[PDB]
Amino acid sequence: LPSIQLPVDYNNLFNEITDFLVTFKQKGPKYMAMLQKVANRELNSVIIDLDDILQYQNEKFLQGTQADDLVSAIQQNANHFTELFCRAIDNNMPLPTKEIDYKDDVLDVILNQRRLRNERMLSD
């Protein structure tokens, strides 16, 4: 498995994606509001507009803090960036603002009981 040296650093791109999600504005940030809606079970699909990414890159370049070209990286290889964006969204998911019936979901109960079992095992 010989290695190659490609001019892409996924850590910097992940930082770029997180900054774009947190700070981008077009009120509060558009994508922060979208994630808040998703948390309350109001939205089940998030769409990333490449126009917003291009505008954010242009603004960053204008401010003098030139950043990596995220639009081209997304276009050239989009499969990895889906997972990258999913991870970025997960790391910055806001807490729900509308109470929901957690106990109704099977997954919630199963994970809670797995946590209880893990705590019991650790206490041993």
């Binding site: 009981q113 209880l116 079992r117 019991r120």
Partner: protein
């Protein structure tokens, strides 16, 4: 005929006792049970009888086990001694 009728009745009683272990619905109905031990740990069993009864649940728990302790029997062929 009298003995045959008596034996048929005996088999009928045995089958009636066996019936309680059979599910009314088909096998693929897919009922899952969770049973709580005295300590807060849950074990999983499958079958309608498990949900409706506890002794059946423990019997199934026992029965499901794979490991068997070896039993050695000292058998002597009668033909050996003639």
């Amino acid at each position: 005929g009298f003995e045959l009728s008596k034996l048929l009745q005996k088999e009928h009683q045995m089958r009636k006792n066996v019936i309680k272990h059979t599910s009314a619905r088909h096998s693929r109905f897919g009922g899952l049970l969770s049973i709580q031990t005295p300590d807060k740990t849950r074990l999983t069993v499958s079958g309608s009888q498990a949900l409706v009864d506890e002794k059946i649940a423990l019997q199934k728990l026992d029965d499901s086990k794979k490991w068997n302790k070896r039993i050695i029997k000292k058998h002597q062929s009668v033909a050996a001694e003639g």
